[PDB]
Amino acid sequence: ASVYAWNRKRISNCVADYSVLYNSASFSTFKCYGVSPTKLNDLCFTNVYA
Amino acid sequence: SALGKLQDVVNQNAQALNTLVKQLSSNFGAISSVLNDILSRLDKVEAEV
Amino acid sequence: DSFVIRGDEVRQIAPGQTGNIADYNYKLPDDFTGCVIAWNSNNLDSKVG
Questions:
Q1: From CA B31, how far away is CA A6, in angstroms rounded?
Q2: A11 CB-near residues (< 8 Å, 6+ apart)
Q3: Where is this region: Integrin-binding motif (chain C)?
Q4: Which has the closest alpha carbon to B48: C15, A29, C39, C27?
């Protein structure tokens, strides 16, 4: 989407691997807040919104 | 009503301990009051701070 | 300590990092005392094909 009217995708009812994301150095930035990017595989969430 | 001086000495020691326990629920500027949140969510380079 | 890596992977050459260079090739200690010096060597270390 255009940034004035951004997408919001509900991510739910699944197992997710974040190591496959943050190790893909093609990402020019990978900030995280309240969590370490390396630690995400040891956690669960009620939903995730992308 | 007579033993107010002795019941006061019981009450002050209990209120001081209950206050000392309640302060474990405070954040003090951390991400959580619960130390296992900090340790389960962060790497040492963040968790030490 | 001396080596060649691609320009993206230079950001893994710091204490407490993770990813294939930090994990499997060259790991710095959490309390490293020292300096990391890096430069583009495309003129010396690249070759055609």
A1: 29
A2: A47, A48, A49, A50
A3: 6-8
A4: C15
